[PDB]
């Protein structure tokens, strides 16, 4: 049942993940009866330093909240199946271009479709189980931008090792180096 | 600290939290929030009353946080929006109350002064709403249609 949960099936890696998903459908009582109707949008790979890798599943985002309901169970099962791989559940959002003055009008690009907002939602979804409590931006002596994220000290244990995963994956999405924070 | 009509410089207000999303401990459903909002509106309570009651009685912090949209917009989409925005209507109610007091007892002059202040505020707000076009462009507030809108 791999075929109809990707909407198109190149990049055989997804198939294994889909097979993984199939192998986790079979846990019927708690991880099914809703888990079937969750289409994908071309899960991708990210190189991770230290020998690991990060696989980013791209939800079409009509019902992202369903993922964010199942997420802890599904992510832990996927981690168990794939050794030395860190799975993340990213929303994919359609970025729209700038309303450049010379380009013809395209009916009011909504702010939810804009670079800053989409990257913010990317960061929010990158670490789901723990919520972001604050945001900081720094610029070193040279003049390059770095961003710091005040995570909740409570509940952090749903990560406990995935900080480099988030760092590297978001770097490869945009390129801006990031460091995360743990408060007292 | 502005306080157009009094040199008072206070800053009494509320600082809503940083978390745009809902609190993690909330168990109510956003939809059920919507139906209770609409039913209280049917009872007639203004969206400020709606917000204060939902904050006092239930885990409703900000209906914008929970339902993803704001109370007046919920009412407008559901077709329960009042013809006159609540703040304006309260201004008319206060102005007509002061007018009745003034006509009742003539010599009170600070009453007249506060009435002038209130009429200034109400003209100002009506101008704003006409620019945003919530009100009809011919909507005018003087004395008698004022009393009719009091009803």
């Amino acid at each position: 049942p791999q075929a109809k949960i990707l909407s198109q099936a190149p990049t055989e890696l997804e198939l294994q993940v889909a097979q993984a998903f199939i192998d986790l459908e079979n846990n019927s009582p708690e991880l099914k009866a809703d888990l079937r109707a969750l289409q994908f949008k071309s899960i991708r790979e990210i190189e991770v330093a230290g020998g690991k890798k990060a696989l980013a599943v791209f939800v079409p985002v009509p019902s992202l909240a369903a993922y964010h309901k199942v997420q802890i169970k599904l992510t832990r099962e996927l981690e168990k199946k794939f050794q030395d791989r860190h799975v993340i559940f990213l929303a994919e959002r359609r970025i729209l271009p700038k309303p450049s003055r010379k380009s013809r009008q395209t009916q009011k690009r909504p702010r939810s479709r804009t670079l800053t907002a989409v990257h913010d939602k990317i960061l929010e979804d990158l670490v789901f189980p723990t919520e972001i409590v604050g945001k900081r931006v720094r610029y070193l002596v040279g003049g390059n931008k770095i961003q710091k994220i005040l995570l909740n000290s409570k509940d952090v244990q749903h990560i406990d090792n995935k900080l480099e995963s988030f760092q590297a994956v978001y770097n490869k999405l945009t390129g801006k180096q990031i460091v995360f924070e743990i408060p007292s | 600290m502005g306080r157009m009509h009094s040199k008072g410089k206070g800053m009494s207000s509320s600082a809503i939290p940083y978390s745009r999303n809902a609190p993690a401990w909330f168990k109510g459903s956003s939809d059920g929030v919507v139906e209770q909002i609409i039913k209280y509106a049917r009872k007639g309570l203004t969206p400020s009353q709606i917000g204060v009651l939902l904050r006092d009685a239930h885990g409703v912090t900000q209906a914008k946080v929970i339902t993803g949209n704001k109370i007046l917009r919920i009412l407008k989409s559901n077709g329960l929006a009042p013809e006159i925005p609540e703040d304006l209507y309260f201004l008319i109610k206060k102005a007509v109350s002061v007018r009745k007091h003034l006509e009742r007892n003539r010599k009170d002059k600070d009453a007249k002064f506060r009435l002038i202040l209130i009429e200034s505020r109400i003209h100002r707000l009506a101008r704003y709403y006409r620019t945003v076009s919530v009100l009809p462009p011919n909507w005018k507030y003087e004395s008698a249609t004022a009393s009719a809108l009091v009803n």
Binding site: - | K76, S77, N78, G79, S133
Partner: protein
Amino acid sequence: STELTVQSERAFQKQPHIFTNPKAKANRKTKRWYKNVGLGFKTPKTAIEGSYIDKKCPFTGLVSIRGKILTGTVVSTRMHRTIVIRRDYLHYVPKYNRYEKRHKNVPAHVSPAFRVQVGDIVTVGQCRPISKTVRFNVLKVASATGKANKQFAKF
């Protein structure tokens, strides 16, 4: 506009030097001549299908457009077949390196093909003189309503 039966006053308004033959065995409406004014401006459909005469219509009459093109806002409509357009602009006074709000009022002549309300913004064109003060014809009402598009609100 000319407002309900252009054939109104003591003389006949025939579109000059155009003849519709009664002898014709078709009984067609009329030979309603027109022309494309140029400058990449589209003549409105009501200019072709319309029933007015308006010798001063740049689209159906005898007047011709050339020269300056202005973009203003309609401020006065009360006079017949003609419009008064406000033009607000800035004037650089150099002694203070500052700018000065100024406004002029240019009359113009609107063809019946155009509907104009107070507050509209209008692309107007210079023409052969029409009257003592009129030297322009309206060519394009850009904002027919603009913000008056919607008139109600029923979700």
